[PDB]
Amino acid sequence: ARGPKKHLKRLAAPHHWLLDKLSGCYAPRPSAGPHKLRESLPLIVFLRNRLKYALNGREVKAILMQRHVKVDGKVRTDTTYPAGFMDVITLDATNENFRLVYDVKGRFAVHRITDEEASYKLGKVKKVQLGKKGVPYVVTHDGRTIRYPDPNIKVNDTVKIDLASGKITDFIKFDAGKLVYVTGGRNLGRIGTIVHKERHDGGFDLVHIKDSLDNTFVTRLNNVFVIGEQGKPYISLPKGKGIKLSIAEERDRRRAQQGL
C-alpha cells in the first residue's frame, strides 16, 4: 500500500504488552530502533502501564523530555523508543535501575537491580564478519556492532558489552553445561541447561534443554540465549528463577499464599 505503515491498532499490538482492549483504539507503534516491534517494549508502555508513574501519553512525554529516562546509558526522549530484551533502562531522580528480563509466563517483567551490575549488558552475538578495511566485527541481537573482538567469539554466542565504550569484556562459549534463557515461541521465558544440540543442515538446529526440575524440552536455536555457566549466571535472574510451574501447583502455591 504505497509506502510504509505508521499506525498500529489495538488488536494488532503484541499480546505480551497486556494492553486493555477498550479505552483507546490505537497501540503505541514502537518506532524503529534496535529491536523488532513484535518483540520490543516501548518507553510509554513501560512507564505508563507498568510502574504507574505517568497516567496519560502527554504525561510520559513530560517525564521523558525533561531528560530523565536513559536507555543503555543514553538519554532518550522518544515516547516509543523500542526498549528490548536485556536492556538496562535507568531512572535518575529515583536512583533506580532496571533490566528488561522476560517473566516466566511470557510477558516482560520489571526486574529491579542494584547500581552495580547495571553497568553491563549481555548480547547474543549473531554474526561475526571480516568488515571493511580488513577489520573484524561482531554484531549482536541489539544492533550493537563491536570492532576488533577476540577471534574465539563465534556465531550464536554471547558477549558482554558493558555500557561505557563497548569494549567487550570476558565472554562465554556455547556448549553443554551452560545456563540458557529462551526468548521465543511456546517455551518462552524458561531458563535451563543445554544437554544436546542436533544440527540439521538446511536449517533450524533444534536444541535440547533440561531445566532445573528435569523437564526436558526443545526449541529452535534462534530463541536460545546463553547466559553463562550452570549455577552461575552473570545477571540477576528474575523472581522465581524460571521454572514454569504447571497450573495445578500454581493453584497450590497461590492458595498457599492466601492465609497470612
Partner RNA sequence: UAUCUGGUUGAUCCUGCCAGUAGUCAUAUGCUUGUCUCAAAGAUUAAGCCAUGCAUGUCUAAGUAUAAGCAAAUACAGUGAAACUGCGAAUGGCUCAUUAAAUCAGUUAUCGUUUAUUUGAUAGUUCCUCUACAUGGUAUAACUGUGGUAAUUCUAGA
Partner RNA sequence: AUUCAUAAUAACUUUUCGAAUCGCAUGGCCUUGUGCUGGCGAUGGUUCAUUCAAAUUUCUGCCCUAUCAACUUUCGAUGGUAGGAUAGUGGCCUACCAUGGUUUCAACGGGUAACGGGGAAUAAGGGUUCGAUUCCGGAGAGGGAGCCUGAGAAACGGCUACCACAUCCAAGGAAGGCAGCAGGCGCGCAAAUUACCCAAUCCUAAUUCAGGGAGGUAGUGACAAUAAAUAACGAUACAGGGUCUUGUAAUUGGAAUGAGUACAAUGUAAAUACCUUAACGAGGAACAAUUGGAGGGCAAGUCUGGUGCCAGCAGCC
Rg (CA), the chain: 20
Q: Which is nearer to other proteins, 1 or 25 (CB)?
A: 25
Q: CB-wise, 64 or 101, nearer to RNA?
A: 64
Residues in contact with other proteins, shown as a per-residue x/- string from 232 to 251 under the rule CB under 8 A: --------------xxx--x
In the complex, minimum distance from the CB of residue 159 to other proteins, in angstroms, rounded to a whole number: 33
Among 18, 62, 135, 176, binds other proteins (CB under 8 A): 62
147 binds, among other proteins, RNA, none (CB under 5 to 8 A by kind): RNA
Binding residues for other proteins restricted to 131-160, rule: CB under 8 A: none
Q: Which does 145 bind (CB under 5 to 8 A by kind): other proteins, RNA, none?
A: RNA
- For RNA, the binding residues (CB under 7 A) are 1-12, 23-29, 31-38, 44, 48, 56-58, 61-62, 65-66, 72, 74, 79-82, 127, 129-134, 137, 139, 143-147, 165-166, 203-204
Residue 22 binding other proteins, by CB under 8 A: yes
Which of the residues 73 through 102 are near other proteins (CB under 8 A)?
A: 91, 93-94
Q: Residue holding cell 526522549? A: 77
* Distance between CA atoms of residues 167 and 186, nearest Å: 35
Contact (Cβ atoms closer than 8 angstroms) between residue 235 and residue 99: yes
Residue 17 neighbours by CB under 8 Å, 6+ apart = 27, 41, 45, 49, 107
Q: Which is nearer to RNA, 39 or 96 (CB)?
A: 39
Cell of 214: 528435569
Q: In what order do the strands lie in the sheet with 224-229?
A: 216-220, 206-210, 192-197, 178-182, 224-229, 232-233
Contacts of 57 (CB under 8 A, 6+ apart): 44, 48, 79
DSSP-assigned letters across all residues of 110-164: -EEE-STTTT-EEEEEEEEEE-GGG-EEEEETTS-EEES--TT--TTEEEEE-SS
- Contact residues for other proteins (CB under 8 A)? 9-11, 21-22, 25, 52-53, 58-59, 62-63, 66, 68, 91, 93-94, 246-248, 251
